[PDB]
Amino acid sequence: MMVWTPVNNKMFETFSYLPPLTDEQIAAQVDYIVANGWIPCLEFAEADKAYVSNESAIRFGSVSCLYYDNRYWTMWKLPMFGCRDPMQVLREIVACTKAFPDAYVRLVAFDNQKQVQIMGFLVQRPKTARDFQPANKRSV
Amino acid sequence: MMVWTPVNNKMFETFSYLPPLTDEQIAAQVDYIVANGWIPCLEFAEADKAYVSNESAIRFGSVSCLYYDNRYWTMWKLPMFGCRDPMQVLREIVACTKAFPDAYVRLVAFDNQKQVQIMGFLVQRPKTARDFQPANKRSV
Amino acid sequence: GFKAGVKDYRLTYYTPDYVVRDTDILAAFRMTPQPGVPPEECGAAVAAESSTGTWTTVWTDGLTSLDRYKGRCYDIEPVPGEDNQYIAYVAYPIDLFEEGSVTNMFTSIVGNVFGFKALRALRLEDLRIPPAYVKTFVGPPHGIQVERDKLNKYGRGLLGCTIKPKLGLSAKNYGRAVYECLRGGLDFTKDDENVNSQPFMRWRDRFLFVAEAIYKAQAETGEVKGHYLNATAGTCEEMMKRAVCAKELGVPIIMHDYLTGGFTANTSLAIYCRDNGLLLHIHRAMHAVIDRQRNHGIHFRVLAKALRMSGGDHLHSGTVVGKLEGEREVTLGFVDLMRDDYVEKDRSRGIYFTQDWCSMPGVMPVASGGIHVWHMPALVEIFGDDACLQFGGGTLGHPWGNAPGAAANRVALEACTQARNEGRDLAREGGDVIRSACKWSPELAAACEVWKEIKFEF
Amino acid sequence: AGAGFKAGVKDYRLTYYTPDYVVRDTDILAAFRMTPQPGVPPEECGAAVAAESSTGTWTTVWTDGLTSLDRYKGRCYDIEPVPGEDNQYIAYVAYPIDLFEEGSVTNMFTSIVGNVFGFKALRALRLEDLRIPPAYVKTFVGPPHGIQVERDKLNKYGRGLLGCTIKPKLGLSAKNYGRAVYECLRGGLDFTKDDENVNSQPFMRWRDRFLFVAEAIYKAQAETGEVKGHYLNATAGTCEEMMKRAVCAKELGVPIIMHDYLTGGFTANTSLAIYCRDNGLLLHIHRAMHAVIDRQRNHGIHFRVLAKALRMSGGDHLHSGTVVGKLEGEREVTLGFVDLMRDDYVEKDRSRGIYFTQDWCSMPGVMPVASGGIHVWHMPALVEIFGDDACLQFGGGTLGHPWGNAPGAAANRVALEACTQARNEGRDLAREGGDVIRSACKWSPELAAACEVWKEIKFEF
Amino acid sequence: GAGFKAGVKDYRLTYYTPDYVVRDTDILAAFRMTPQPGVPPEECGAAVAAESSTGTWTTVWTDGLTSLDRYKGRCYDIEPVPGEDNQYIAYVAYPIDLFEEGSVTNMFTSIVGNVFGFKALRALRLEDLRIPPAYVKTFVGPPHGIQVERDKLNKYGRGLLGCTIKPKLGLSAKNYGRAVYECLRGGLDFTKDDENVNSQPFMRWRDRFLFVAEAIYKAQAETGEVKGH
Amino acid sequence: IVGNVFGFKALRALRLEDLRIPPAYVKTFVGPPHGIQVERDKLNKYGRGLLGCTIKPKLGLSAKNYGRAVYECLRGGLDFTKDDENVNSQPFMRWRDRFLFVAEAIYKAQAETGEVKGHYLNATAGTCEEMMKRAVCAKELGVPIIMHDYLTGGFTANTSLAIYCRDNGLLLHIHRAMHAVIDRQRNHGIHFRVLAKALRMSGGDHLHSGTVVGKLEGEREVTLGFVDLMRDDYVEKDRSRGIYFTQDWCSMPGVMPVASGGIHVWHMPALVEIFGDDACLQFGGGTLGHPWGNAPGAAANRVALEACTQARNEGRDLAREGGDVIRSACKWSPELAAACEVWKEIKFEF
Ligand SMILES: O=C(O)[C@@](O)(COP(=O)(O)O)[C@H](O)[C@H](O)COP(=O)(O)O
Ligand SMILES: O=C(O)[C@@](O)(COP(=O)(O)O)[C@H](O)[C@H](O)COP(=O)(O)O
Ligand SMILES: O=C(O)[C@@](O)(COP(=O)(O)O)[C@H](O)[C@H](O)COP(=O)(O)O
């Protein structure tokens, strides 16, 4: 019987329960994005503004249901509309991680028909980050 | 095609749509009463206090649902408990009509298990009453 | 200890040696297992998955006392004349249920089990609601006695009438038809179950005109009159608005579709009716989706007990003889369940459990649907005085109009009551009583003439 | 000369059977699976259904002349015989829009399924589908949020959502309830839920539960850094109670409540959906008691109808069945009504039980929830059936794990995330299903302990 | 193709679609358009359709995040006006999704909100609207309507007769009631406050209401006919 | 005044050009909830125009996307963003969803820039009850400002809302949707100056004044006049400006003119010249139309405005050296440069 650790095992939504994505597993997802016609986009946030919190709810009445800060990240350039080139997306991932080496960075895709974000996973965790666990030390 | 008259065709609950009860039809009802163990009783009312109205609702707020004046009539003597004698009931009807010749009078019977009046029909209409129709002149 | 993995339900939830407690709720299921699923296991699956159990073993069981809280299959009868059908008996502890909530009781007892792959069909035939659970319900707003006392009506059935056509009439015409029916000698008229508020007739317009009719007919006949105004609605707030308006208008009675409305809305309305002295007429619209088939569903007697608890002064009982199905023996049984304080187990009537209602008022049965004057004696014979009999087509289908139509039915009903009272046996001299009355009443005669040939037998 | 009042019975088919009728764009259409009594002509039986669910009774009434029966009558306009069936027909009825109260599922059901099912003149009746026209659809508030808005509020994209009914159903104290909830949620589940019959009871009073669950939600959310929810139950005996509980949930700031729409009822349910819209609560709908109505093929109402109904009344999630789990659900029909729940426009498709083209005219979609007797092995099948827009729930499949809830949760989350990656990578889940799971068991110790325990377990009969 | 291209372009490129088949649920507007000299009718019609629906003056990138096809107003037909040099009827179709259920306010805000003030046109007139049933069903609509009114009032088989009290302003509440009583008892069904009779220093509203109420009831008792004000 | 007379057979056309609202009548009105001074004090913003931006496309965006766009615009340096006048509550985006996401955007941008931010959440609605419901939610969210379409909503609803705003300290932005139906033609209708006096009395903190130079009509001299009527305490008769009466507002607060619609960075100096500091300038397309997105778009406009303000302050005459000030700033700011490049040729003259 192994025990799942409460310290500091912070996750990151889709795919953060799998082993970290290889540069090629990332590329495979980008193929799936362009395969389906979806719009790719990059978002980033500094170490603080990355996790969901609620310090603006100090200004609220009883209306803080489904309100959390730091849902929104900062948009890297614009979303890439009708840009059907897998190569060019991977290049933008690089340009972005390069400009913000200390940021969290995630890749997202929008479906414009349903008008909703259709996928999204993390591509860069900052180096200073001490609040996650490697995939093997999650249970002791 | 005959038309049912609105003037003045006032009725009186149970049996008032049949032809008026013969002294022996009355007696047949009283047999039914005694046969079933029910308590017989006589009630009466003067010409005004006979019909359902609502002049006390002038004192009410919005609470006059299922409130009507003149539901209660005046009890003749007392109910005849365990009195299993059909003869004596008929005598009391006579006693009462004799004492109040100008009153409406009705025979009623109580079930004490269910605690409810279990039957009731009119036995005397006052002579001055001009607001009823004989059984044949109800439709023209 | 905790042993992960699947095991048989029967290990934990089949307990044939269990003594039922006076406070247990008991369910009688008509079970039809899949081929090769042993009856004991099926019965235990039902007991499990309507109480404490899921499909694989959970550790959290140890935190509590499963012995205290588990549903228990405690007896299985095979069904005579049936290869693969059993009556499974489940006992549920009282602690399983929210006080005063029919909705909760149904959620547990009929919530999921009916959908199990491991069975072909399931039917809930009866529940035993123990006194200590019955005491947790407000129950009917008034009940038969109080209703009779409020209306000042005794010693005969009550007479009602659904306005027709079901939909299509304006408020003004609705009231017009109402006045004519009421003044002829009917006690009640009603909105049709699906008359709510629609483009052709908005509810408040109807409520006003109906109020007016009720008052005209009452002043004219000198008898107390009523019309069941429909409070059934999209939302509780709309349902309540309508009830409040009925109250404000002084009218004595409203109706609700408890099944299409729902138990939660219905209990809310019953409580409002208790608190404001409104009589509550319950229409069972949609019951036949659930109670028609013998193999699968919930039997009507259970939907009736349920409504008695939630709250209603009238509940439609069926006619037996009219246009909608209703077998005689089973009907007499659930009418007893509706009306009586104590009803002894009687399998010949479909009554699987002794039901003690511990003083909860009784609900009045309403017999409605394709019945006319010829049925009168049969109806008076089945139901007795404590029933409401309704003639929709039976009144607005009379050749001389509503007033005559009403008069006809009133006379027919009074005649049969007198006859019954005089000693005549209604089951035999039925036709005779009616015939004597037609030769006597012109309005009744016109009615007998038109529906003489009309019967509902298949 | 004319058309006057003629007292007495006649056939329904004279007025209510109109096979030459052109259906209007605004008519509500019904598809009944009719089974007449022997010797009752199909045409007459269908007209009876149309009549007694609209404007007609059993004998001719005079009041008909005051109004225009033409304008308002229900109309049986087509009858198909059923292949492989002696005495079974599909009767098509058209009801004018005027027959119905705006925004009222309750009223629609009252007309269409009110009385007819109980007719002596038929052996069985089953409502298979309804065509709710745009002009009626637009009268409903409909779902409080819908799939897109839910995903936006919760900030969750690109995969199914994971849920979990706490067990045992009944018997757990409030403190223990929250305990379990915290442990499931921290392992990687998105949601947990009250069991449908967990309301307020002697062993656990609802306000105690709501408080402890709120604390569990917030602990788990702070620990994982992912948004968490638990469907607190607002199902209650009275509307006033039901509202009290919704209000408390709002007051706690928790994201989501649940309602048993059929046992609570449509009136109560529409009320709650309106409250949820007005306050930003997500509403999870449990379909307790549907099987009493929708299980048999000959009689009742088919679930796809009960699902259109819930979509109109209001819900953010609706239970859709699993196909592969412990409760019945045929695959093709399920794919159909899931489309009915989720999509804006669904073309007629009889292979899937869809009798009518349904245009939902922008009413938000309801998220299907697949729950009941599923475990990790079922994962690929589930992802294959439902896609991303669903929520998968593992009650036993979580609290039944040998290592407890957090490990249980973790297992399921890995299982789902693996299939999603595979799917995305091009791997066909219908074939390579077992492979994806197996790769992931040899990789994750928690998933492995799970696979081991439920490897033999299937639901086929 | 089809990415984000900054800069102004012609409205006609996106908002003039003369090959469009109107849907049964679209709201349709008929505008009497009068473009500035040298502004092509097609472009002026599309400007109107754009700026009353989804479009602004330069291209915005956010268009890509949604489906303009689904949401855009469409100029779909232009008739020239006989006997008119520079006047056209432009036809605009708006998807139902554009509008708030039950809100006349929202409808007028879109349709007649900004466009009438465009530099690119001399004049604009909205001549008609096609309110589709599926939009109409979202309104409560009139409280009663002709039939129900007549039924309430118990008045049938003739025009109804009303009368605006005069002088418009200046009368005291008591005089107002007096005049009202005299007009109603003559055989008028209705009298009325003048549109600008609200509540003023010479006659406060609650005063009027009370006296009018009295006039209504006197006239009604006297004539035996139902009376209103 | 405008009830019946415009429809008389005895005349061909009628136009109301001005009204003289006497102090004794003015004093009977609550008037604007806050007014220019109080607004500036509340927002802590001084010594320049305010910058706003209508989210685009007008309709079609989801709540989540709306908030996303809002955050990007606000963090670039705009003071305000706003719902489009016809953004109320619709199938594609329900109002409460929008209000919540926008609130989040407002707070993120505020924390990031350290400047006070706002978004005019639209309270315009079908019924007063709905209008109020929306205002209450905005208050409950702590957001500083809401908007109303006073003409399509109507005066009665508007005055109600203004009073609510006064009572709860909400800023009220007024959109004049539909005015052009009434005020466009010279021969018939009501002139806008009258509709502006009216709004000032009914209540509003901002009122759209037109641009003169942008996509919608507005002659310069008349505009300068009614802007004075909106802002000032005392305005002398001046027929050259269409002001037929001396208007004394007897201390009723002033309404802030909002200049919006088809304007971009090249218009900046003309705008600063016309309105001065006490105005709000709005760039919808002018922001979401920028080739690098909203944040850059915002930054561009903010720089353009700050430059013109400095120039003005330093003595430079903006009516002449206009193009110069802008040009200096493009060669200096990459974001502004990209903006100037795209809309250089774009003008509105007919
Ligand atoms: O709609 C109808 O058919 C009725 O108004 C009867 O009309 P008629 O009297 O004209 O036949 C009742 O609702 C049915 O009795 C319901 O059936 P049940 O009582 O079995 O629920
Ligand atoms: O009570 C139960 O059985 C469940 O909590 C599942 O528990 P497990 O995951 O432990 O099986 C759900 O309520 C069922 O899914 C209902 O069925 P459906 O979704 O078909 O309505
Ligand atoms: O809908 C529009 O066009 C705007 O959002 C401007 O958008 P852009 O900045 O993208 O042009 C404004 O509502 C107009 O300014 C209204 O005109 P006015 O101020 O005259 O009332």
Ligand SMILES: [Mg+2]
């Ligand atoms: Mg009915």
Ligand SMILES: [Mg+2]
């Ligand atoms: Mg459950």
Ligand SMILES: [Mg+2]
């Ligand atoms: Mg006037």
Ligand SMILES: [Mg+2]
């Ligand atoms: Mg705008």
